[PDB]
Amino acid sequence: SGFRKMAFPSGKVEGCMVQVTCGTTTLNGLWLDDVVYCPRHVICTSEDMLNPNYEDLLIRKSNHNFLVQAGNVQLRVIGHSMQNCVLKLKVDTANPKTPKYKFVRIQPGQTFSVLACYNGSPSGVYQCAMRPNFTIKGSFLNGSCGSVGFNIDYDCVSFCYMHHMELPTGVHAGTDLEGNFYGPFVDRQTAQAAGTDTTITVNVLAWLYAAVINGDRWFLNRFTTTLNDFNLVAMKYNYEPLTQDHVDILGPLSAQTGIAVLDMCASLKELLQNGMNGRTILGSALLEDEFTPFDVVRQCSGVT
Amino acid sequence: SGFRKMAFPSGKVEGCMVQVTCGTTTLNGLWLDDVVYCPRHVICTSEDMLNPNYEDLLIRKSNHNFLVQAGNVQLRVIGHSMQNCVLKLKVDTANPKTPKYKFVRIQPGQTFSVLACYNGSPSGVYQCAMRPNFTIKGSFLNGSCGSVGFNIDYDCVSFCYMHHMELPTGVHAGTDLEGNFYGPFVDRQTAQAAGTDTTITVNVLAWLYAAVINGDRWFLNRFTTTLNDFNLVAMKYNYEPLTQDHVDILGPLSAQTGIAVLDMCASLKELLQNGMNGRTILGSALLEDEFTPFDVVRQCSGVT
Numbered sequence: 001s002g003f004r005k006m007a008f009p010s011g012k013v014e015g016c017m018v019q020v021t022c023g024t025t026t027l028n029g030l031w032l033d034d035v036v037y038c039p040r041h042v043i044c045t046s047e048d049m050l051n052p053n054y055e056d057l058l059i060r061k062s063n064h065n066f067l068v069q070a071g072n073v074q075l076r077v078i079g080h081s082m083q084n085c086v087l088k089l090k091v092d093t094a095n096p097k098t099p100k101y102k103f104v105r106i107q108p109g110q111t112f113s114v115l116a117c118y119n120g121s122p123s124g125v126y127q128c129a130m131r132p133n134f135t136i137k138g139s140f141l142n143g144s145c146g147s148v149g150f151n152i153d154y155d156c157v158s159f160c161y162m163h164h165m166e167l168p169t170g171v172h173a174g175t176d177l178e179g180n181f182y183g184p185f186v187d188r189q190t191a192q193a194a195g196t197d198t199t200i201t202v203n204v205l206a207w208l209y210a211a212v213i214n215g216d217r218w219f220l221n222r223f224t225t226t227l228n229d230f231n232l233v234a235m236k237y238n239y240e241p242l243t244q245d246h247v248d249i250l251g252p253l254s255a256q257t258g259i260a261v262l263d264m265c266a267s268l269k270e271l272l273q274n275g276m277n278g279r280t281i282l283g284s285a286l287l288e289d290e291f292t293p294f295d296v297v298r299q300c301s302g303v304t
Numbered sequence: 305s306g307f308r309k310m311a312f313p314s315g316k317v318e319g320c321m322v323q324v325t326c327g328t329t330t331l332n333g334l335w336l337d338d339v340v341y342c343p344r345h346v347i348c349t350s351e352d353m354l355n356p357n358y359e360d361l362l363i364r365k366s367n368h369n370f371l372v373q374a375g376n377v378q379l380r381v382i383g384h385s386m387q388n389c390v391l392k393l394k395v396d397t398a399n400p401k402t403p404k405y406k407f408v409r410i411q412p413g414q415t416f417s418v419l420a421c422y423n424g425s426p427s428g429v430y431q432c433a434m435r436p437n438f439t440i441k442g443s444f445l446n447g448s449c450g451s452v453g454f455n456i457d458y459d460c461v462s463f464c465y466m467h468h469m470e471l472p473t474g475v476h477a478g479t480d481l482e483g484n485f486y487g488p489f490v491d492r493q494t495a496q497a498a499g500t501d502t503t504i505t506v507n508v509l510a511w512l513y514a515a516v517i518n519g520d521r522w523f524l525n526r527f528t529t530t531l532n533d534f535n536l537v538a539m540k541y542n543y544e545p546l547t548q549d550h551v552d553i554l555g556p557l558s559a560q561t562g563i564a565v566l567d568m569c570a571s572l573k574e575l576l577q578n579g580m581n582g583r584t585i586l587g588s589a590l591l592e593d594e595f596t597p598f599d600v601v602r603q604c605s606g607v608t
């Protein structure tokens with residue numbers, strides 16, 4: 001029993017973190033096979049960042065200008081390329097600690113673990129969700145650029161996120177491992193707004209199922225609702241509309257608890273309209289939306 | 305910016321996890337040098353657990369009865385001993401992945417990372433606090449026994465906790481790496497109550513400093529208080545009394561924010577007496593006590 005915001009064990013990803021320096025700028029790189037991936041703004045100076053012409057900036061850089069350090073060993077750069085907003089530095093040595101890996105572009109509402117790094121060294125690991133507005137509510141400081149987000153499927157690491165920037169909002173923006181930003185963000189030092197963020201409804205329901213599995217049943221009621229009626233309430237409270245696909249994904253949790261999805265929706269409706277009245281669910285005074293139905297099943301079944 | 309319940313990178317500890325089987329029971333072991341540490345209740349059957357005589361039970365076990373598996377390789381047991389509530393199985397091979405380590409017995413209120421494991425394999429990592437009542441509010445299932453709690457100081461892992469049991473309360477109890485339980489708990493299948501748990505006052509204040517550092521300043525007020533007056537309020541709300549030692553430990557955060565500790569105490573007093581009025585602090589609708597002042601400094605400064 002118990003329910004925590006759990007991250008994947010980070011060992012496979014720690015063995016991939018390197019330091020990349022270009023001029024005066026130092027950030028984190030991801031070394032997989034003979035390629036080091038990092039945010040392309042490593043080639044910029046503070047004045048370049050206001051309106052950078054990355055193609056012209058990269059043209060003034062040669063293989064010897066990129067310094068790559070793995071722990072205390074210097075890697076030799078033999079190739080360099082820009083793919084969207086990431087640089088691919090070809091090194092002469094394949095990473096002996098390269099785990100089985102994939103590059104995946106996650107969907108908003110999906111979750112992942114972040115290994116926050118500084119100077120090629122890991123400092124901590126935490127669980128995140130890609131928000132519907134394509135930002136992440138992480139914990140990142142100056143020097144954290146190049147830190148990656150991932151998931152693990154038994155032995156295979158699926159890299160999904162590379163950290164690039166913080167919006168003045170305090171929220172974080174970044175790319176997939178092909179350098180494509182999630183959202184409308186650009187790697188330029190200019191005011192950028194993350195659109196309106198919504199609450200991931202399917203995740204809150206999954207967490208209400210995790211609460212029931214853990215003994216927290218006070219919010220359960222004698223009511224039911226319909227997809228259309230619950231959706232009228234979801235739009236009022238900035239909640240993503242619930243679809244039959246979401247209902248299907250909640251199937252294993254509905255079967256495990258014996259509570260039909262539409263009955264769980266009616267508990268959520270009353271929680272939205274009436275608040276929590278000073279009570280808590282899984283040690284929380286608000287409705288949690290950063291646990292997917294897969295996360296709930298995995299945590300409640302002990303998948304290693 | 306941003307503030308998350310951050311765990312230490314778990315790679316150094318994943319390289320130490322093994323599976324220990326004794327009869328029908330399988331649990332997790334910690335392999336460091338030529339010794340595998342695990343909870344002593346691995347030698348028990350469900351009937352033995354009601355009132356176990358560990359000394360007599362262990363007498364019926366020989367080195368060959370303990371099966372130790374590291375990934376897919378079988379370790380050879382050449383010695384066995386019981387130290388309080390843990391078994392020390394001497395193996396013929398030293399763990400090549402043994403990091404620099406210490407065994408420390410943490411104080412209540414201090415924090416640590418848990419690498420939850422099943423069958424010698426890690427499933428996730430999360431941050432915990434040792435509660436004033438010596439329990440931890442973890443996420444553990446059957447098979448998770450032997451999972452460890454630790455801290456990392458640059459390259460040195462300080463093992464502080466080994467998971468042994470769950471109380472019917474849903475909270476978790478365990479030992480230090482010498483097998484001494486934190487709290488009054490015994491490794492017997494009998495009703496055990498964790499005493500009254502208090503809120504770690506110094507940690508809530510540290511988190512209020514992390515909130516100020518992150519832009520959340522709504523709770524700051526035009527009031528001040530004294531240690532004695534604030535303590536009258538702390539006892540009313542099941543909060544640990546604040547001492548001058550706690551005030552001193554908050555010194556770096558007080559210097560960084562420019563807000564004197566007694567002024568932060570007055571904000572906490574008004575938050576206790578008036579609640580949050582539907583507002584949040586660092587994305588939370590309740591007062592968080594599982595971040596020490598060291599955790600706040602480390603997260604807000606990027607210590608790797």
Ligand SMILES: O=C(Cc1cncnc1)Nc1cc(F)cc(O[C@H]2CC(=O)N2)c1
Nearest residue numbers: 140141142165166167187188189190192
């Ligand atoms: O934020 C960091 C660096 C950093 C600091 N703190 C946390 N995480 C990252 N760099 C950065 C990189 C970049 F290509 C664009 C950019 O634009 C600003 C304007 C806007 O909004 N974002 C900022």
Ligand SMILES: O=C(Cc1cncnc1)Nc1cc(F)cc(O[C@H]2CC(=O)N2)c1
Nearest residue numbers: 444445446469470471491492493494496
């Ligand atoms: O709880 C688990 C096994 C476990 C299950 N779920 C989460 N974490 C651990 N074993 C266990 C071991 C033990 F030596 C004593 C004992 O007494 C019960 C009575 C009381 O309270 N605790 C239980």
